[PDB]
Design a protein around this motif. Structure first.
Motif, PDB file in Angstrom:
ATOM      1  N   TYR A   1       7.040   7.566  -0.983  1.00 43.08           N
ATOM      2  CA  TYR A   1       6.737   7.358  -2.394  1.00 43.08           C
ATOM      3  C   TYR A   1       7.911   6.663  -3.059  1.00 43.08           C
ATOM      4  CZ  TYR A   1       9.360  11.858  -2.710  1.00 43.08           C
ATOM      5  OH  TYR A   1      10.305  12.889  -2.614  1.00 43.08           O
TER       6      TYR A   1
ATOM      7  N   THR B   1       7.015   8.172 -10.957  1.00 44.29           N
ATOM      8  CA  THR B   1       6.863   8.150  -9.490  1.00 44.29           C
ATOM      9  C   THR B   1       5.444   7.713  -9.080  1.00 44.29           C
ATOM     10  OG1 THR B   1       7.116   9.655  -7.478  1.00 44.29           O
ATOM     11  CG2 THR B   1       5.998  10.614  -9.428  1.00 44.29           C
ATOM     12  N   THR B   2       5.355   7.149  -7.887  1.00 45.51           N
ATOM     13  CA  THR B   2       4.056   6.976  -7.207  1.00 45.51           C
ATOM     14  C   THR B   2       3.726   8.264  -6.435  1.00 45.51           C
ATOM     15  OG1 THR B   2       4.896   6.196  -4.992  1.00 45.51           O
ATOM     16  CG2 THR B   2       4.628   4.506  -6.803  1.00 45.51           C
ATOM     17  N   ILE B   3       2.553   8.308  -5.798  1.00 45.29           N
ATOM     18  CA  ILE B   3       2.299   9.317  -4.813  1.00 45.29           C
ATOM     19  C   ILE B   3       2.704   8.790  -3.437  1.00 45.29           C
ATOM     20  CG2 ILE B   3       0.368  10.387  -6.060  1.00 45.29           C
ATOM     21  CD1 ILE B   3      -1.498   8.948  -3.873  1.00 45.29           C
ATOM     22  N   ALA B   4       2.607   9.643  -2.412  1.00 49.27           N
ATOM     23  CA  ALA B   4       3.066   9.251  -1.075  1.00 49.27           C
ATOM     24  C   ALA B   4       1.903   8.591  -0.352  1.00 49.27           C
ATOM     25  CB  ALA B   4       3.474  10.456  -0.274  1.00 49.27           C
TER      26      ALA B   4
ATOM     27  N   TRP C   1      11.415   7.158  -1.043  1.00 53.39           N
ATOM     28  CA  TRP C   1      11.646   8.466  -0.395  1.00 53.39           C
ATOM     29  C   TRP C   1      10.618   8.720   0.697  1.00 53.39           C
ATOM     30  CZ3 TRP C   1      15.548  11.906  -1.668  1.00 53.39           C
ATOM     31  CH2 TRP C   1      16.345  11.542  -2.761  1.00 53.39           C
TER      32      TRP C   1
ATOM     33  N   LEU D   1       9.265  17.877   6.322  1.00 57.31           N
ATOM     34  CA  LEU D   1       8.782  19.257   6.264  1.00 57.31           C
ATOM     35  C   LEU D   1       9.636  20.073   5.293  1.00 57.31           C
ATOM     36  CD1 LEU D   1       6.992  21.411   7.687  1.00 57.31           C
ATOM     37  CD2 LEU D   1       9.043  21.974   9.090  1.00 57.31           C
ATOM     38  N   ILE D   2      10.956  19.866   5.363  1.00 57.87           N
ATOM     39  CA  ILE D   2      11.905  20.576   4.510  1.00 57.87           C
ATOM     40  C   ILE D   2      12.521  19.598   3.504  1.00 57.87           C
ATOM     41  CG2 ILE D   2      14.122  21.870   4.343  1.00 57.87           C
ATOM     42  CD1 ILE D   2      13.196  23.267   7.102  1.00 57.87           C
ATOM     43  N   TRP D   3      13.208  18.553   3.993  1.00 55.12           N
ATOM     44  CA  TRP D   3      13.857  17.617   3.094  1.00 55.12           C
ATOM     45  C   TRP D   3      13.041  16.343   3.045  1.00 55.12           C
ATOM     46  CZ3 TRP D   3      17.915  19.383   0.263  1.00 55.12           C
ATOM     47  CH2 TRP D   3      18.661  20.446   0.811  1.00 55.12           C
ATOM     48  N   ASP D   4      12.918  15.773   1.854  1.00 58.76           N
ATOM     49  CA  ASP D   4      12.530  14.348   1.735  1.00 58.76           C
ATOM     50  C   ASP D   4      13.836  13.545   1.736  1.00 58.76           C
ATOM     51  OD1 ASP D   4       9.972  15.453   1.252  1.00 58.76           O
ATOM     52  OD2 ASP D   4       9.795  14.683  -0.769  1.00 58.76           O
ATOM     53  N   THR D   5      13.821  12.385   2.369  1.00 57.64           N
ATOM     54  CA  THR D   5      15.022  11.588   2.561  1.00 57.64           C
ATOM     55  C   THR D   5      14.858  10.230   1.886  1.00 57.64           C
ATOM     56  OG1 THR D   5      15.508  12.686   4.655  1.00 57.64           O
ATOM     57  CG2 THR D   5      16.439  10.440   4.397  1.00 57.64           C
ATOM     58  N   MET D   6      15.871   9.807   1.136  1.00 55.99           N
ATOM     59  CA  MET D   6      15.799   8.517   0.426  1.00 55.99           C
ATOM     60  C   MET D   6      16.039   7.377   1.440  1.00 55.99           C
ATOM     61  SD  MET D   6      17.384   6.114  -1.517  1.00 55.99           S
ATOM     62  CE  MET D   6      19.055   6.594  -1.898  1.00 55.99           C
TER      63      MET D   6
END
Ligand SMILES: [Zn+2]
Ligand SMILES: [Zn+2]
Lengths: 54, 163, 156
Positions: free
Chosen positions: C24, C35-38, C66, C70-75
């Protein structure tokens, strides 16, 4: 009508909402928050998991 | 370093459907309100009379502020329902707040203004009115200590899962 | 408000495997964020239009992409577009492909650029809508602000 798994009230538009990084429940803006780590990583945590760990 | 700040994206639209006042005979009305935004729809129960009070709140988590909230008041029929009136509220006009508001009384119109197959207003006013509130809420902030706790807890779990 | 900035977040193109990406895009100008959606894949299409009320022009539009975890979203990449550089037009455009950088550069806790290019690109259209008129009082205010960006109100 997908609906927040915490309050069971807020309805999500397609693709909206966040999954709790711990329990994976999808929640709305009233029902959890975001933790940002440096400028490149974010996680999401619902208010039920927050309560549990208090 | 580690922040619990929720930031400033306005995603949670809250709508308070309060009441309506119709011009005409009260036995003529058994009405409900439908709300439509970003292809999500919600509805009150039906309430009889020329001054129905619903006092119902609805929440929508969305991401497209460029559209509007369509509000319709419908008179219930055993076979078909008939629209009493409608308004369309551009989402950019809706306040950001953390509190419920008093609402404002809006005149209900009879018809949508359509352009390029999309609603962009309403026309042909009726003598009926609806009392409606709407506001966006900001995301919650998690206090710094509690954020640091969660980051470490789930970083450790992530590290374990990757192994 | 000098102008309405339109930003069309069109698509992106990631280097590497399709299944690695579920992305996203977020935008920030001043304290307004969107923001957009994913959307999944190596060439996701958002096609989402955003608008911002702009009163100062010395800053920029921060764009971040981004990737969900599962846990972190990463830029996965960012660009910073100085506002003074954005085309002035009412007309929507096809977008330009911009190479995404790895990180922001800061001056005084605040973004002033980006560095370290990635092999990923984003397709973005951005333009300032023309105001209808500029009242004499406001023209004096804008003239002062623009004249420190080596700029000046178009005489017409
Ligand atoms: Zn909720
Ligand atoms: Zn949880």
């Amino acid at each position: 009508a997908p609906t927040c798994g915490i309050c069971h009230k807020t309805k999500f538009a397609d693709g909206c909402g966040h999954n709790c990084s711990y329990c994976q429940t999808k929640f709305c803006a009233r029902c959890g928050g975001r933790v940002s780590l440096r400028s490149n990583k974010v996680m999401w945590v619902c208010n039920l998991c927050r309560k549990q760990q208090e | 370093g580690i922040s619990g700040g929720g930031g400033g994206i306005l995603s949670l639209l809250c709508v308070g459907v309060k009441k309506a006042k119709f011009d005409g005979a009260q036995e003529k009305f058994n009405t409900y309100v439908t709300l439509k935004v970003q292809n999500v729809e919600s509805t009150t129960i039906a309430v009889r009379g020329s001054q129905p009070s619903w006092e119902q709140d609805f929440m929508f988590e969305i991401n497209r502020l460029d559209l509007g909230l369509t509000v319709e008041v419908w008179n219930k029929g055993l076979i078909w329902d008939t629209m009493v009136g409608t308004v369309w509220i551009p989402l950019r006009t809706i306040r950001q707040s953390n509190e419920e508001g008093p609402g404002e009384w809006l005149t209900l119109d009879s018809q949508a203004i359509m352009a390029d197959s999309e609603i962009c207003g309403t026309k042909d006013p009726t003598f009926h009115r609806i009392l409606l509130d709407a506001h966006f809420e900001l995301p919650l902030d998690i206090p710094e200590e509690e954020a640091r706790y969660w980051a470490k807890k789930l970083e450790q779990l992530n590290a374990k899962l990757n192994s």
